[PDB]
Amino acid sequence: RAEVIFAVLCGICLLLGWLGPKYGIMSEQFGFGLLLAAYFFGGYFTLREAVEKISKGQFQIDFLMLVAASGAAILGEWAEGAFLLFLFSVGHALENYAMGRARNAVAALAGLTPDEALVRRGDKTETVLIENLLVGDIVVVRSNERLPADGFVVKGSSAVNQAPITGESAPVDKLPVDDPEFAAANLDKLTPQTRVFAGSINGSGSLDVQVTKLSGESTLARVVTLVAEAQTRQSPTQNFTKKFEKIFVPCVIALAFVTSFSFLILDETAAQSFYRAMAVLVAASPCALAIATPSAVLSGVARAARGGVLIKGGAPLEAMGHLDAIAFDKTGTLTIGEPHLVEITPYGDATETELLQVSAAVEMLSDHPLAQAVVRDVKDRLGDLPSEASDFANIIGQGVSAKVDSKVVHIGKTALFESVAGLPLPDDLRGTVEAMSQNGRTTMIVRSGDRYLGAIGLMDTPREDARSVIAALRDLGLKRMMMISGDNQNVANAVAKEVGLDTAFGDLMPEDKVTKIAALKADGGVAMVGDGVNDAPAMANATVGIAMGAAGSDVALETADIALMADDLQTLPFAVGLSRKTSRIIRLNLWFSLGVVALLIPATLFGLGIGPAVLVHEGSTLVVVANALRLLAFKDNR
Ligand code: BEF
């Protein structure tokens, strides 16, 4: 059920009703009945726009073209009224397929938070709605559940996936606060081992969480609100046309009456001064504009799709050229989103091969996220893997222990070796590791009996794509750029140097990304490129939101106005380039479409009739359509 086929039927009826009676075997009784159908199908939808708004509202172009057809039938019947209602009906349908809007992603966001929470009541645990949690309530979050509230940990220890908010999908170890009365009074001093957020996914261990924000004030409830209370962003060419229509219709109706009464002052017959009014009426119908403006959009959109960029409508395709600034998420946007082994630092008499073989011997038994990366990359660097360790056990929150070659091996955080029986950590190795941490490596220290073997460093490296695409976009004039990541500052700065972005912010919350975007939007067009929930508010508030089409959260793909379906960043230079040509093509088509009307209004006030009207309108429409079709040939020049 769609009305676009009425335009098709107007075509079939207009063509066969026009051709058959004159270049075929058809009665004018029948070909006129086809012209009647070409008015019926043309009129039935185009009518309602005017009827509906003019019942209480203001005048609009849909009034002009709809009565123009009636005039064409009443006076000098040429059935060009059909050419008008056909071309007006396609003028609607082509706009119909151009539209898109930002607020739509609500359906996914709700799934991130549970409806209910277990809450302690002395010797009982009750079930309550999150709407009914008071501050200072102790909720119970058990294994693999969604956390219901922003709070701090007060009982138990676990590994929590904070991906919806930090953008990092690696579990973060959480531990209980040492005094909850102090923490509740001094939330600003909450270590990130203890703070937790709603919509995080719990790990193996149950946690008691003391609530600190109400249901409506959690960081995720803010993400929901900011995505919903974002606006639509107007196409400038559309709103220019809105202005023009509102003034143009009451402008041309002046000529409608002045020329209607022209016989009273000038030597002309009354019925032909009425034909003068109908001529300037039906000439005024901007059939060129009604086709030119959407056809550039639909063409460029389909070209983008064949180039691997999904575009949600005309507005972002127009905005993408005029950008002064662009901002990038790190994790999963500029980086792939997974740790790689990047640094190896032997110690004492340990060789590099010994450090890697003991590391892989133990990490073959772990199920922490880093372990698979250690095994992958040791097998790549050495070509082969050692025998697995014995006696594997976790040291919860700090690392692991195992046994290799009859010697006890500990691997983990610097805090583990301060906490366990063996030789204390050397003061120089401590500093070498701290320098790896400052340079943005997640670091493990490896110790074997008497001997520290050394340390290894892993980092989520940037896409090879990235530095090339950044410099490219600078050449196209995007001299305002920054990175805004929820990941910690050392990883952000290290990847910023690797990618070549000089301003880089980590440890951001989603609202902080909206703040950096607002500081850019004030001074130009800004685009936001991202892959996760914590980016969706910035995507909605920015001038144009762009999601990684494959790594993207469904929230981001719904919210964004652009999706890079390849996860190829080199689509961005193409996307802005096509946008610019798309703006040029319609810019030129706009002044053709106006001139054909604005220059031939007086040519019909000079007495030209309906016969020239249809021909000129046909020529204008054909030229605008063909010029728009240039965009299908646009080239990547990659
Ligand atoms: F995923 Be982004 F780096 F916050």
Ligand SMILES: [Mg+2]
């Ligand atoms: Mg991300």
